Design a protein around this nucleic acid. Structure first.
Lengths: 51, 70, 432
RNA sequence: CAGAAGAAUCAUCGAAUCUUUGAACGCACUGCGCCUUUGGGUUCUACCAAAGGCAUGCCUGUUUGAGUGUCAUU
RNA sequence: CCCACUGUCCCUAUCUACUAUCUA
RNA sequence: GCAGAUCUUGGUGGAAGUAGCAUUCAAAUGAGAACUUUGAAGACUGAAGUGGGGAAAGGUUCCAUGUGAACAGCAGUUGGACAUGGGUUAGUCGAUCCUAAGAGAUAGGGAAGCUCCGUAUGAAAGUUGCACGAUUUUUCGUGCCUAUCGAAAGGGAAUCCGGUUAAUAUUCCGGAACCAGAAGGUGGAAUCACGGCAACGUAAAUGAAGUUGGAGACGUCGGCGGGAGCCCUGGGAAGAGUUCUCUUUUCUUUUUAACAAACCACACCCUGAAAUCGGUUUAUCCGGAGCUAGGGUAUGGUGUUUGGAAGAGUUCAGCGGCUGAAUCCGGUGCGCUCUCGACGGCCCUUGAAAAUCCAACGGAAGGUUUUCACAUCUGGUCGUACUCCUCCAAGGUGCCUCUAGUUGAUAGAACAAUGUAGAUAAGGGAAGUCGGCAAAAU
RNA sequence: AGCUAAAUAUUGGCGAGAGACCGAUAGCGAACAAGUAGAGUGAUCGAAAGAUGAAAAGAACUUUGAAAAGAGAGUUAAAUA
């Protein structure tokens, strides 16, 4: 719809019920979630080796 | 203009103060059209049997200024 | 036309936040609060807080914009600014080592009169008489507190004078109706010009400041009430024809005469009229003198309680001798010895009470609070089920907003209190 | 010409009114704002109207400030 | 240069409209 | 003190009444009609109009009534002339708002100076920049973040139909909608909601500071698909034709708006693991970075059924405004016009900005919230008449015709010579002229 | 480093009184209407135009004509005003 007409729609009608829904795609959301977890593990692994 | 298919809600929206005028249309198909004028929307109802149509004439409140065919 | 910008009118325009009210008046919080004490201003919460807060949700106090705009043109605000200027000139005078110029500055210190504040807050005298009880409660509370570095000695002296003048008026006009005794203090209830006045006087004891209360706030309330009481007392004395203010006997005050120092020279109210009570050195004279003289009874008291006693200990004219001490070595005759609760019970019930029951060393009848009214069913100290359930679980079944839910508190609390104090009479009878 | 009956298209002139502009001064060149106060209407947290305000440089004063500027402070 | 063609020419003639002319 | 100065100003002569400047019939009006009006006939533009609209520009030229003084290379009963009055109606159309290249005041610096340079520049650059607080020695502390002009063709909240004037209509009348903002109220919802493996769905389902994301917002070309209108055409109906006969024939017409309801198909998800390569475009594109196939999800370009809505409009019949009927069923195409979708190239310089709106992360705070439904109210200012770089554009075979618009351009009479233009010509055929220059030949 | 009346100048500004001046192609561009009509995108340029009679008594009325006007008439000392 038009940018001005988007206001009239309900909150649930403009956003998808998921984390980062309505701003990032589901495939991108899955990739972002996976990448963050792996990077966190690498930081945990690197910290243990450095310790 | 919302086409209305529920007689009971047509009755309650007629009793509600928003209703102003009502018109009855008799087309060639022996169908009776109840048009109710509201503040913003014109609600219409199509009935096909005369006895229910007549019964809903007398069920409408007398305060409503109903009118016949135009 | 133009597209109306969201939130440019309505609650967002009518209500103003506290911080925005501060920056609008160019005031500090301490001065904004102080002007809000003197004027009649208070927070107001809107129905839609989020809408009034420009779509935000943080908990923020609101004021009427019209209330704030009324404070833009307040002559007192310019007096707050004049005090800031004077305080800095006093600082420069002392910092430069000019003691005499500091004294001159202190003499011309900017002071402001609360005349127009009282007028614009209370247009008519009866309006003042309505919300005069809170002022009287505080002036009596602070007339017995010790002087602090926060609240001055002049303020304490004025509170005593204003309180004593009002007590003198009530005694003179016999406007007192009821006097009730509680752990908090003494609750007095009088009527003036039809309006009802209820205040509290604490017992004089060497208390300690709680150190958790902000005495800056107490300063502004004391300043407002003292101005309010002064003008009220002036009108009341003019109504009675007494010249205002009544003269102060310095010698009598130096001897702690209490109310006797102030002489009101002219410019069932007779419950105890035919009686001459005597006060021993164990009773609240500051309370007993007030009530007995208000209802016509003549008063004599122990010399150590204050000079100016018209009666002596040996005077046989004494009708009753109030003495709370459980032992009286020099017992008199014809001066029947009672307890203080006898007088106040008589005041509350408007009738003479049983001196035998209130005699020294006897049991004490329970104290009745005249302010407590008889409830619908509360204990005064002195085939159907199917229809019932159907008529009781249909509003909680069918009714839209279930506003019937208020019964869960109105009836519940009243019934629980009624059940407790109704079963109490059963327990006490069983104990007896 | 018509019409009206201290008149007057009179004189004098010390009291007033003086629309939009223009050094032109809220911003622009049909408009767009902000601030203070007051008022209205089938009628009030909305809308509207009215009145008085808001240019720049500088001078005297006032108030409020800033400074790892110059110091004082048992 | 050859061939064809034609009023360019011998040698002009005829037709048509417009122009030209007169009238208000 | 004037005869002269190609003298100055004014007035007036001969030249000189000289040079000169596709209509027809009858009727009406008028003192008067080659020029006005009506009717008939004959012609001209021929959708690229002499057509119908707008921009700029003009200013009342728009309409009605009156006049025939000055205009009229002629005249008028006549003009865009004169006189007198009338005429432009908007919450939805434009401006107003935003920014573009640039311009430009302010800060500072020049310059004797009228002034010039300079546009976040060594500016204390914040319209109430924002929040916090039982009030802080009733003298304010802590924390955070840090110009204006310039587009009536770019961006952008919202309206349609029918009717109506001598002249105005998305504006007025009648009917029907829509947008924005504002508060309460009523009903419903959660105690910071559930379901689905998933893509995601639903009547709702708080979100401070702080941090991001999206729309706006983006080149050009080609082919394909979809829809609408227009064009073509079969019937049905109506009327008007033509009709000795033939011709179930000829011509003309046959409407549904904004808006509101229910339903109606390429990107992704789930099972799946594939080449013996499959699917497939008009144009070979994709596939272990997971094909074909099966089941879903979303996006609905659209289409279906209505409401609006027949009460309107149009066309036929009548009656005296009223009453009847019909306004139907198709078929279609490299058709034209407009738009949307899915591709494929070429790019190169990989393709404005801002206003504005939405969402995410975040977790401050706590009868509350509630992005669900319904009622109620308001919408200012300016342009709007008319005239005219650009819009709309029928059929058949460069012509002809329909729709539409004119029939005016000073007229009449004669047709010698002259001049221009266009033709034909016996015999010869370039003998003409400096010469096949122009014609015919091809 | 500084101030200071009078005598002095004066095509403007507010008024005045005059003249061996000009007498409507003159005198100011403008005696009236004047920086006006008009011209030019603009800066700017820039005219022509005075006289009925003492009084409007400005020609009633009749007639011809569509009208403009004509002819009788009338007003005036005079319409050869």
């Amino acid at each position: 719809l038009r940018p001005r007409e988007f206001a009239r729609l309900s909150h649930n009608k403009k956003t998808v019920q998921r984390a980062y829904g309505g701003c990032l795609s589901a495939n991108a959301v899955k990739d972002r979630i996976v990448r963050a977890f792996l990077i966190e593990e690498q930081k945990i692994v690197k910290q243990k080796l450095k310790q | 203009p919302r086409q209305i298919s529920d007689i009971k809600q047509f009755l309650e929206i007629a009793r509600r103060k928003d209703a102003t005028s009502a018109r009855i249309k008799k087309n060639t198909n022996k169908d009776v059209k109840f048009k109710l004028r509201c503040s913003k929307y014109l609600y219409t109802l199509v009935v096909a049997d005369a006895k229910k149509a007549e019964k809903l004439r007398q069920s409408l409140p007398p305060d409503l200024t109903v009118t016949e065919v135009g | 036309a133009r597209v109306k910008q969201k939130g440019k009118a309505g609650a967002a325009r009518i209500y103003i936040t506290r911080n925005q009210a501060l920056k609008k008046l160019q005031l500090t919080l301490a001065d904004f609060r102080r002007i809000c004490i003197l004027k009649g201003v208070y927070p107001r919460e809107p129905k839609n807080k989020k809408k009034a807060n420009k779509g935000s949700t943080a908990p923020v106090t609101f004021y009427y914009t019209k209330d704030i705009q009324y404070l833009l043109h307040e002559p007192i605000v310019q007096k707050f600014r004049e005090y800031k200027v004077f305080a800095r000139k006093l600082s420069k005078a002392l910092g430069k080592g000019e003691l005499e110029t500091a004294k001159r500055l202190e003499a011309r210190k900017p002071t402001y009169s609360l005349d127009h504040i009282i007028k614009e807050r209370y247009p008519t005298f009866h309006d003042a008489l309505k919300d005069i009880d809170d002022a009287l409660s505080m002036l009596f509370l602070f007339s017995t507190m010790p002087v602090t570095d926060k609240i001055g000695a002049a303020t304490v002296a004025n509170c005593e004078r204003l309180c004593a003048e009002f007590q003198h008026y009530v005694i003179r006009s016999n406007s007192l109706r009821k006097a009730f005794l509680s752990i908090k203090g003494i609750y007095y209830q009088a009527e003036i010009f039809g309006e009802q006045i209820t205040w509290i006087v604490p017992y004089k004891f060497a208390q300690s400041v709680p150190t958790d209360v902000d005495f800056r706030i107490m300063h502004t309330f004391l300043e407002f009430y003292q101005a309010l009481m002064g003008f009220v007392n002036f009108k009341l004395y003019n109504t009675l024809g007494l010249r205002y203010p009544p003269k102060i006997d310095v010698a009598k005050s130096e001897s702690a005469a209490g109310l006797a120092a102030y002489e009101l020279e002219e410019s069932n109210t007779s419950l105890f009229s035919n009686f001459t009570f005597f006060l021993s050195r164990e009773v609240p004279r500051f309370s007993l003198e007030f009530v007995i003289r208000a209802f016509g009874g003549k008063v004599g008291w122990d010399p150590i309680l204050g000079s100016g006693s018209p009666f002596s200990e040996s005077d046989p004219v004494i009708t009753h001798h109030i003495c709370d001490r459980p032992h009286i070595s020099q017992k008199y005759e014809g001066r029947i010895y009672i307890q203080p609760q006898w007088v106040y019970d008589s005041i509350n019930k408007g009738i003479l009470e049983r001196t035998d029951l209130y005699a020294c060393g006897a049991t004490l009848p329970p104290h009745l609070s005249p302010f407590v009214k008889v409830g619908e069913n509360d204990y005064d100290p002195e085939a159907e089920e199917k229809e019932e359930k159907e008529a009781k679980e249909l509003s909680k079944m069918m009714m839209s907003n279930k506003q019937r839910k208020l019964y869960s508190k109105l009836k519940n609390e009243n019934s629980k209190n009624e059940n407790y104090n109704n079963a109490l009479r059963n327990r006490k009878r069983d104990i007896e």
